[PDB]
Amino acid sequence: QTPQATSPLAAWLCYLEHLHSQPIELGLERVKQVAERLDLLKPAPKIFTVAGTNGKGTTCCTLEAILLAAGLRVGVYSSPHLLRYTERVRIQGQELSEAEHSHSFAQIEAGRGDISLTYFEFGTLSALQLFKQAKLDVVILEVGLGGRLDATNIVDSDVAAITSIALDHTDWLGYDRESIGREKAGVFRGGKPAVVGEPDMPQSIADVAAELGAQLYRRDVAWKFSQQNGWHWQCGERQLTGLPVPNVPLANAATALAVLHYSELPLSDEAIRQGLQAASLPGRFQVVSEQPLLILDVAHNPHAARYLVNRLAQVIQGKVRAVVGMLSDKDIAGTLACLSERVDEWYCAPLEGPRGASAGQLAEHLVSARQFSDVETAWRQAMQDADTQDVVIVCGSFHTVAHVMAALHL
Ligand SMILES: Nc1ncnc2c1ncn2[C@@H]1O[C@H](COP(=O)(O)OP(=O)(O)NP(=O)(O)O)[C@@H](O)[C@H]1O
Ligand SMILES: [Mn+2]
Secondary structure: OOOOOOOOHHHHHHHHHOOOOOOOOOOOHHHHHHHHHHOOOOOOOEEEEEEOOOOHHHHHHHHHHHHHHOOOOEEEEOOOOOOOHHHHEEEOOEEOOHHHHHHHHHHHHHHHOOOOOOHHHHHHHHHHHHHHHOOOOEEEEEOOOOOOOOHHHHOOOOEEEEOOOOOOOOOOOOOOHHHHHHHHHOOOOOOOEEEEOOOOOOHHHHHHHHHHOOEEEEEOOOEEEEEOOOEEEEEOOEEEEEEOOOOOOHHHHHHHHHHHHHHOOOOOHHHHHHHHHHOOOOOOOEEEEOOOEEEEOOOOOHHHHHHHHHHHHOOOOOOEEEEEOOEOOOOHHHHHHHHOOOOOEEEEOOOOOOOEOOHHHHHOOOOOOEEOOOHHHHHHHHHHHOOOOOEEEEEOOHHHHHHHHHHOOO
16 A cells, blocks of 8 residues: 555655566656656755765765855765665755655655656655755765666756776676766766766766766866875865865765865865865764774775775784675675785674575685674674774675664664
């Protein structure tokens, strides 16, 4: 049966998960016609759309922090979530109530008529509706997957960004950097800045930009940055020097400053520095504890692992103990392989559900590793073992981090 405005959010989620979307027509037409019936295409006068393999969420949160510190009204749509669906929509930096979501979903359901929608299209229309009612200055949309045919690409953005390009998957057709970049570049718009924060950009992105007439601004061509004792960013003759080091990856803060620069939004020095000092996201190199250092990071492909490994380097005797759980879909071998550079002891756990790999399915790739019943036990063991100079890193998937967030109820 169909949920109502007054139904709990869990009943909506249960309903959207059970949609029979296998046969529905591929492409933006369905979701776009629904958005048009409900007038949801312009949720705020200023819209930024952020695509990429890794770094979308922390880029959007840097933009968010800076824009809030400037006194603007801001909404962020993000995905996926760790513990609660309500993570996906922030207004003024904060989550909304379950009831606001149930009411917004009810409007979407009324307005779609007999037009079918997937889970993510439904969720994206609902976020647009929540932002529209909220009288916002800026809306930042994180792309769900790819871009081109992502539900968020029904909105025309004022600036679009690609944070990075890397492989997040295994046995896959046409699955190369060029193909990947091409999909992501479909969020670009004719006459609008297209920010690419990927330093090794595939040509297909320039091809798509040139075809649309977007203005491409690439890292290491139009703008750049480096770490110093803050860090520095440049776009042509504009320089922002001695910046505070944020609790997000530097590359993504840089892409975020590029987005803001080309947006030509007027923003103060103080907003930028305050936003940067406030920016962070749970599960993204999140230090949960010291002596021993406990870090949660949702890294789940080789590109993130490598970043992670470089990060663990610059927080260094002392051993590195990894609590890992991953999904079967992912490049488990590349990821583990990359992490093995700096990981000393392995604690492998299983993830629930169909997609979720077995502890042995993980250990299969590791010279030696201990195996466990659940993520929480693996994690609690690693913490027992930790000397005060050690590092315990929880990683491999959103779900692995979520268990410890939720076992820690943080
Ligand atoms: N520019 C980057 N380069 C390499 N790794 C990155 C980069 N940005 C983020 N990461 C890594 O990817 C993880 C996810 O960062 P995030 O900013 O949440 O990415 P995202 O694209 O939203 N994908 P997801 O985390 O699944 O929502 C981080 O914990 C890091 O492990
Ligand atoms: Mn994300």
